[PDB]
Design a protein around this ligand. Structure first.
Ligand SMILES: Nc1ncnc2c1ncn2[C@@H]1O[C@H](COP(=O)(O)OP(=O)(O)O)[C@@H](O)[C@H]1O
Ligand SMILES: Nc1ncnc2c1ncn2[C@@H]1O[C@H](COP(=O)(O)OP(=O)(O)O)[C@@H](O)[C@H]1O
Ligand SMILES: [Mg+2]
Ligand SMILES: [Mg+2]
Ligand SMILES: [Zn+2]
Ligand SMILES: [Zn+2]
Lengths: 282, 565, 621, 267
DNA sequence: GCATGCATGCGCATGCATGCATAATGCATGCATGCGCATGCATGC
DNA sequence: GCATGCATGCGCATGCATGCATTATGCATGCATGCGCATGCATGC
């Protein structure tokens, strides 16, 4: 009849998905104990208790995962960005499995932050060079500055000027990365006149927000070379990692070595010697 | 406005309630039996009467009348929910579509745990698994409307119309829901259709393809798709309802699965339908805004004794007309002023399948058939197939029409070979013709009746008295039964025994001998014997006898003698 | 848009002026009863005389003619106010009411050829013929949608031609919720209005000879959808505006001009009761005598024409049988016996009269035709002369020159009154109930007395039986008859219209006596006025008489007597054969005479008059 | 915009619930005398105990604490209805009335250091000291103009923070007629409302020793303009919302969070 | 009381996140009408 | 009645006015803070 639009539907199906399934089985199966006294389900019970108490975070030791299956542990050491997402989805699915009979009304299943911990000996901050980009590194230091906690968006929704149509549930990228709005209104309009150029506005009240913090880390005075100025580093903290460190503490931090991504902006200032340099962080 | 849940519950209880009506004189659970049959493939569509609902709640009926489509969907969902309760056994024999439905339900039970979260897009479309259709019957209190007066006030309502059929479309499948398979996954994608045209999809919305970001591409399938039977109908007003000096108006109807193949061109029909628009996108127009075209969606389509007692006299001609109607070609030639046209009009009105032509108005393309945007549409001779055709002022027709009529009478098929048309048409119809005062009529036709106006005083006075009675009291001096009697009569087929042949043979020979004695006689041939045999068989059929008898042969001989004299 | 207006002197004053215009309390105005009639009839528009407005308030009329849209808006607001005042309940049904216009516009009375840009944005009047029409289409005004996901219903309002210029923000159909939940359209709750487009051409009679015609395009709104049809002569009053083209960068600077109609017009008790009850027979006596003073003598033809004007009675029965009720006449005479004058007078007097000479119209243009529409590929029906003249009169001059096939075609109309049409793809039965006048010259130029009428007429018996009456007229050169004819002709010639100076270039029941048009001797009698004659004819045509038992046997016996006298008439020949149609003709003429004098039943005198007519017409010396 | 809403179960039910909450006929409630006091004092806002609402209707309190804006709108509508009911004459003066909140919020009692994105779009309570204040500035709500050329007056309505997101079509000051005749602004007939901005810091007595302080920014509307001064210890209850940045192509994805006060208390 | 220390205080430079300003051309579609063809109607002789 | 004339009628090509579709990058401005300077206050001896 040319008026309605019922949409699109699909049905459940009859290698990354297999990786997520492997992580889920690891979480549901892992146990620690003895043959004499049996074994206890470490991560299952831990996730159950944390979700029940309201703490949306768990900590995973890489040695346990390597014991369970070395392939996934080796994978996490090389491409943390994707396998972290897969492991978080597996943790969310397990938490849904264990705590199905929740109190009424609170049906919404929230995300879960997965932290990492290992017994590997650290390495000097001076060893950070080009070869370690996008890998997982462990570094000691002393914290000297900590900015205020701010808000950063993970899901956004935008509206059109003329026809007031909406694009919803757009996923933002983690880290210090931006987003560019589209310029064309994607609506089929025949006979109707069309929308202008650049018609989109960001709706603030319909976005998902998380905590955000930046830290300044200095090389340990115990390991600074004689007669050399100490070096510094900038750290990114998200969600539950905020407020865990006070300036002046001596900390060991495991993270990913990255660069900021805010587009191909032109260099500024009266000095323009450097070409193709992106500010780095962890 | 009222919540749909309460009315859905009311619909369910109404379907579960009624016990009242039974044909055999009892109290029978009708809707329960209908639902039990619906559980398996013993019934593939259900019709709901809005007169039975009126007993308990008329506001439901009014809301159904004004908002018919929403209530149709609600009824469909309610019946689908009720179906599992009434089911008692698995299908004894099932076809391809049932095999898909069973397999999909089985794997849905296999995979989906009761507690896992399911996206609103992850469900099956309602109409894909459904295999039964619901239609409504117009209220008896509701008065049928006229094609001319349905307007914007009637868009979206439930209406009942009566009209004449002029155009019918051949059956073709119509898409309901399209099924897609991804290039790199086992998932299935469903696309509902509610538009005259649609744009096929490309990428796969399945969860696995999304998680892997594989970029798999969809492909259509025809086996998994759902198709329905679709037909297009054209209707016109009766000549009675047209105002002064105007022309009949037309409307367009769409016809669904079981309602398909009910109506034929030239039939008078009553249609219960919903009046809905179609959004039109195309050539630019003068006035801005949203215009639309209207059309009708159907849910139900519904289609010796005295012959012309108003006309005085011609009793033997009336008997011959009765025999022609009953069956096993009659021509009348008369002076002007004798009502020959009115007999043909009565014959046209009485016959189930009939056509009536007046002369050059229906000449040429009005007969035979022609090609129109391509489909071939027939004329009066084609429409009257297996019926009776009536032609007035036969002698004034063009020669081509007369040749076509002769071909229909003798060969019973039409052959057309012209630029763009090369066909043979089946016309198994008997012809009644009228004319004014030739060897062609005697040789080709079976029975000729010559009506000569001899001015006898007594006959003229009686005719005047009868006409005055008709004009004054509007009724003759002291059809459904006739139609039923003819229908019952035509069911049987008598047979000719071996012995009577000799008698018949003798008669024929003697008749021809007399015709050879009277040199003024014109025609006797085996065609006359065939006509006599056919008339005797028709009379035996009237008596419902298995074996031809003597009285039928005598009456046929007497009728032929009266016609010839 | 939050912009609002607080004060406007002109609009408020104009609204006040219309409020005072439509009060009708201290005046003899009628508009109050008009509004009450509109409420009674459920209609929602009014027609107001422009001359009346100018008489009451000339400035408002000047402003309305010079400026249309704002003044029309003020009119509609005032109508809403007064409809609410008289009955606020009825005003709830309709959004806004409308105003029609009527009266002599004067200078603005403009032909389709003389419409110019000088009259833009004003109200104009135009007279023309209709050539193109389009199918009726609905248009959305208010839309309603429902969301099964959230159980919420919303409504959107549309206003496209209400505002002069529209923008892409409006006229957008909603399909999705704020959270992308699908919406289901609910057609029952929406609001639609009908729309049609027609084309009008300057009438060929008015256009200068040898020049191509010019046309205007008209848009018909919801109320005026079915008020026009192709091939019709109409007068349209409405606004003349420009058409906004759709968005673009470069424009040539040429707009399209479209007339938006507001009014469409099809151009056209005690006294009667007393006169009828007192006169009875004298009713038809005077009506026959006073039929046309311009024509001398011929009482029988005047009686027959009056019988056509009154006519018979259409009858139907249980079996669907139809019985004809119309009358048909054929006149044959020598030249200069004023047959064409009679035809022209019947054209002038009869309500629906169409003249169609012998070779002027062919068989296709008489009844109807079927044409394949190139725009859609469908088949459409075009009505001919006889279908247009339903329950009317068709006059055929020079009937003898008509071809045989056309007469065979006319047979269908003359016998049953219907036309059957069929071509592969469509078939119909159109109504064509009608009456026919025909005048035909004799074959030998002048009627031969010695030869029998059959040789002179030269027509078959079937066609003669189709006609109810045959009349033969002769120019006998009697000196006294010639003197009378000369007196009458020169009296009519010397007459001049009263109120017109000599030498210049160029209602009472009974007409005032005239010295020349009537004469000194005729002072003892009077003639009936034309207007009362038309009113009485219409009233008589409405009346439905019934046949009595006294006259049926009498008429049947006389029909048998005629069919036996067929052998007795030895001294004279017969003009027309006697068939079964003669009895129906007798009954029809009896009923026509019973219509002439308003009563309830058919009496013996009407039968006697019918039989006198039949005897006179059917035999000649 | 011609779009309208016909039915909404949640909003209508919430309005009915507040109507029953503020009746005080068959109960020992006091809000009727509070409304009479407000009418007597020409003030146009009310303060309602959160604990009282939770005791009478726990579900409404839960929804209001978890979702602020819609529930506050329903409160304001109910106040308008009851002010019209008791005395319709007084309700003519003001466009819409406002609601304050009071009582023990419990878990939502939050220090400026512990405000997080978890409490966004909810009503929060904060205790702090005032450090920065700004001058009071008027803001236009309804504008009125006059045309000496045509002797016509027009009025334009403005609504910026009433709606979550604003567009360039609105917030445009008219200066010319449809035929380019100049318009003269008439400041007497227009409508303005006052506006102020303050900053609140966590009290040094409460902050952990040796750590830098953290602060929040507050916007004070027309009624609460003069209720705060620098160097003062206050408690503020109000909504915690994001701030819409002006139009642009590329966004970094970091919003600004601003607390919009509804109640300010001098402890 | 005079000599000295010094926590407070002020004005102009650069660095960096947000924010502001710019801005016709080419290609597609439906309406009007010519040109070849076959059917069919009407008109003579 | 048969032979001929012919006004009507239909389908596919091109020509021409309106109408439709497309579409990121570079430069400017205000907030934060270092560095040199002079006044002035407070603290000793
Ligand atoms: N036997 C009859 N009985 C009654 N009416 C008759 C009879 N014969 C003729 N008529 C009347 O005479 C009229 C004959 O006209 P019609 O039947 O058209 O003649 P035809 O068919 O020869 O052209 C009809 O209207 C009919 O009413
Ligand atoms: N009876 C009459 N009375 C008056 N005028 C007559 C009469 N008969 C003939 N005429 C005159 O003779 C003329 C006849 O012309 P017309 O009616 O064309 O004759 P026809 O129609 O016979 O060819 C008319 O102009 C009319 O004035
Ligand atoms: Mg006939
Ligand atoms: Mg004449
Ligand atoms: Zn848009
Ligand atoms: Zn797939």
């Amino acid at each position: 009849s040319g008026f309605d639009d019922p949409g699109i539907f699909y049905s459940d199906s009859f290698r990354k998905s297999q990786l997520q399934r492997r992580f889920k089985e690891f979480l549901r199966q892992y146990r620690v104990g003895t043959d004499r006294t049996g074994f206890t389900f470490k991560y299952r019970d831990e996730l159950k208790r944390h979700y029940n108490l309201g703490e949306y975070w768990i900590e995973v030791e890489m040695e346990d995962l390597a014991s369970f299956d070395e392939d996934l542990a080796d994978y996490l050491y090389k491409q943390p960005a994707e396998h972290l997402q897969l492991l978080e989805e597996a943790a969310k699915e397990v938490a849904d499995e264990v705590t199905r009979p929740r109190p009424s009304g609170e049906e919404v299943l929230q995300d879960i932050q997965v932290m990492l911990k290992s017994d590997a000996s650290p390495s000097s901050i001076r060893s950070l060079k080009s070869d370690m980009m996008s890998h997982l590194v462990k570094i000691p230091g002393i914290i000297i500055a900590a900015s205020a906690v701010r808000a950063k968006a993970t899901r956004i929704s935008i509206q059109c000027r003329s026809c007031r149509n909406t694009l919803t549930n757009i996923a933002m990228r983690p880290g210090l990365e931006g987003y560019a709005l589209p310029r064309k209104c994607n609506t089929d309009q025949a006979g109707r006149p069309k929308c202008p150029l650049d018609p989109y506005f960001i709706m603030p009240d319909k976005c998902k927000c998380v905590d955000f913090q930046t830290l300044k880390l200095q090389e340990l005075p115990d390991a600074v070379p004689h007669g050399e100025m100490p070096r510094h580093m900038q750290l990114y903290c998200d969600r539950y990692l905020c407020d865990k460190v006070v300036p002046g503490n001596r900390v060991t931090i495991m993270g990913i070595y990255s660069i900021k991504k805010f587009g191909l902006t032109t260099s500024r200032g009266r000095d323009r010697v450097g070409v193709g340099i992106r500010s780095s962080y962890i | 406005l009222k919540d749909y849940a309460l009315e859905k519950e009311k619909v369910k209880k109404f379907l579960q309630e009624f016990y009242q009506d039974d044909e055999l004189g009892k109290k029978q659970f009708k809707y329960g039996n209908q639902l039990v049959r619906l559980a398996h493939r013993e019934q593939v569509a259900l019709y709901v009467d809005l007169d039975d609902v009126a007993e308990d709640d008329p506001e439901l009926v009014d809301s159904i009348c004004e908002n018919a489509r929403r209530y149709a969907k609600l009824f469909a969902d309610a019946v689908q929910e009720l179906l599992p309760q009434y089911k008692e056994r698995e299908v004894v024999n099932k076809d391809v579509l049932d095999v898909y439905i069973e397999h999909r339900l089985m794997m849905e039970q296999r995979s989906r745990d009761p507690g896992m979260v399911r996206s609103p897009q992850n469900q099956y479309p309602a109409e894909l698994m459904r295999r039964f259709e619901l239609y409504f019957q117009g209220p008896s209190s509701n008065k049928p409307r006229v094609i001319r007066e349905v307007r914007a006030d009637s868009v979206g309502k439930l209406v009942t119309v009566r009209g004449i059929v002029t155009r019918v479309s051949e059956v073709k499948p119509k898409m309901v829901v399209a099924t897609y398979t991804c290039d790199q996954c086992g998932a299935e994608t469903y696309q509902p259709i509610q538009s005259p045209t649609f744009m096929p999809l490309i990428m796969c919305p399945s969860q696995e393809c999304q998680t892997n970001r594989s970029g798999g591409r969809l492909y259509l399938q025809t086996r998994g798709s759902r198709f329905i039977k679709f037909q297009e109908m054209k209707m016109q007003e009766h000549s009675d309802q047209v105002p002064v000096g105007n022309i009949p108006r037309s409307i367009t109807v769409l016809v669904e699965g079981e309602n398909t193949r009910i109506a034929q061109p030239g039939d008078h029909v009553s249609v219960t339908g919903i009046f809905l628009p179609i959004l039109r996108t195309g050539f630019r127009q003068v006035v801005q805004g949203l215009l639309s075209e209207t059309y009708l969606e159907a849910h139900r389509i519904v289609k010796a004794a005295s012959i012309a007692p108003e006309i005085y006299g011609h009793e033997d001609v009336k008997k011959a007309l009765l025999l022609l109607l009953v069956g096993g070609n009659i021509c009348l030639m008369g002076d002007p002023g004798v009502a020959k046209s009115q007999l043909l009009s009565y014959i046209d009105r009485l016959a189930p399948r009939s056509q009536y032509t007046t002369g050059r108005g229906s000449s040429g393309v009005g007969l035979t058939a022609a090609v129109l945007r391509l489909t071939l549409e027939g004329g009066a001779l084609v429409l009257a197939d297996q019926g009776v055709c009536c032609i007035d002022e036969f002698d004034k027709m063009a020669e081509a029409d007369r040749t076509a009529i002769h071909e229909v009478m003798e060969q019973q098929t039409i052959s057309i070979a012209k630029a763009g048309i090369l066909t043979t048409l089946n016309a198994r119809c008997s012809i009644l013709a009228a004319a004014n005062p030739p060897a062609a009529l005697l040789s080709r036709f079976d029975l000729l009746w010559l009506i000569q106006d001899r001015p006898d005083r007594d006959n003229d006075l009686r005719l005047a008295q009868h006409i005055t009675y008709v004009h004054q009291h509007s009724r003759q001096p002291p059809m459904k039964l006739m139609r039923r009697y003819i229908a019952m009569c035509r069911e049987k087929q008598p047979m000719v025994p071996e012995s009577l042949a000799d008698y018949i043979t003798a008669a024929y020979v003697e008749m021809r001998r007399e015709a050879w004695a009277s040199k003024d006689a014109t025609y006797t041939s085996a065609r006359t014997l065939l006509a006599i045999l056919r008339l005797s068989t028709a009379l035996a059929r009237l008596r419902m006898v298995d074996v031809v008898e003597k009285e039928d042969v005598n009456e046929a001989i007497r009728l032929m003698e009266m016609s010839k004299d | 848009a939050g912009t609002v207006v607080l004060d406007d002197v002109e609009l408020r004053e104009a609204q006040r002026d219309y409020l005072d215009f439509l009060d009708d309390e201290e005046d003899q105005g009628i508009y109050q009863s008009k509004v009450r009639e509109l409420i009674s009839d459920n209609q929602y528009r009014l027609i107001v005389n422009v001359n009346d407005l100018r008489r009451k308030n000339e400035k408002r009329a000047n402003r309305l003619l010079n400026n249309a849209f704002e003044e029309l808006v003020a009119f509609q607001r005032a109508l809403k106010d007064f409809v609410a005042s008289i009955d606020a309940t009825y005003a709830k049904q309709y959004e806004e009411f409308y105003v029609g216009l009527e009266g002599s516009f004067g200078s603005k009375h403009v032909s389709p050829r003389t419409l110019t840009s000088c009259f833009l944005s004003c109200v104009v009047c135009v007279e023309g013929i209709v050539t193109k029409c389009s199918l009726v289409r609905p248009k959305v005004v208010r839309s309603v949608h429902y969301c099964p996901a959230t159980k919420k219903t919303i409504e959107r309002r549309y206003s496209d031609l209400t505002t002069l210029v529209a923008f892409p923000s409006s006229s957008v159909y909603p399909t999705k919720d704020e959270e992308n939940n699908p919406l289901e359209t609910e057609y029952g709750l929406s609001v639609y209005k009908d729309h049609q487009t027609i084309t009008i051409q300057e009438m060929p009679e008015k256009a200068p000879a040898g020049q191509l015609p010019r046309s205007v395009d008209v848009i018909l709104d919801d109320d005026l959808v079915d008020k026009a049809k192709p091939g019709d002569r109409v007068q349209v009053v409405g606004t003349y505006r420009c058409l906004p083209g759709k968005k673009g960068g470069y424009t040539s600077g040429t707009f399209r001009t479209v007339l938006i109609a507001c009014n469409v017009k099809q151009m056209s008790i005690a006294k009667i009761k007393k006169f009828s009850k007192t006169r009875s027979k004298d009713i038809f006596d005077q009506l026959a005598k006073s039929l046309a003073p311009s024509i001398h003598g011929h009482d029988y033809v005047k009686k027959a024409i009056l019988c056509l004007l009154l006519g018979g009675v259409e009858r139907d029965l249980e079996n669907g049988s139809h019985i004809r009720g119309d009358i048909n006449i054929l006149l044959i005479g020598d030249p200069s016996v004023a047959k064409s004058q009679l035809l022209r007078y019947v054209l002038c007097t009869a309500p629906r009269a169409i003249p169609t000479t012998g070779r002027g119209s062919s068989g296709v243009g008489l009844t109807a035709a079927v044409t394949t529409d190139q725009e859609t590929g469908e088949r459409r029906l075009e009505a001919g002369a006889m279908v247009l003249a339903d329950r009317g009169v068709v006059c055929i001059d020079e009937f003898d020159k008509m071809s045989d096939m056309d007469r065979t075609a006319i047979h269908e109309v003359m016998e049953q009154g219907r036309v059957t049409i069929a071509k592969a793809g469509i078939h119909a039965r159109l109504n064509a109930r009608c009456s026919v006048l025909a005048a035909a010259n004799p074959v030998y130029g002048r009627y031969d007395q010695y030869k029998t009428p059959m040789e002179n007429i030269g027509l078959q018996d079937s066609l003669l039986s189709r006609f109810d009456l045959l009349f033969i007229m002769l120019d006998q050169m009697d000196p006294e008859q010639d003197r009378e004819i000369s007196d009458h002709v020169l009296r009519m010639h010397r007459y001049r219209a009263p109120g017109e100076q000599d030498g210049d270039a160029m209602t009472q029941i009974y007409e005032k006596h005239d010295n020349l048009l009537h004469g000194t001797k005729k002072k003892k009698e009077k003639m009936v006025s034309a207007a009362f004659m038309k009113k009485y004819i219409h009233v008589a045509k409405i009346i439905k008489p019934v046949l009595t038992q006294e006259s049926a046997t009498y008429i049947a016996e006389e029909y048998s007597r005629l069919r036996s006298q067929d052998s007795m008439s030895s001294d004279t020949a017969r003009t027309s054969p006697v068939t079964a149609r003669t009895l129906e003709t007798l009954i029809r003429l009896a009923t026509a005479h019973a219509k002439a004098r308003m009563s309830k039943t058919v009496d013996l005198q009407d039968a006697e008059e019918a039989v006198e007519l039949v005897q006179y017409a059917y035999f000649k010396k």
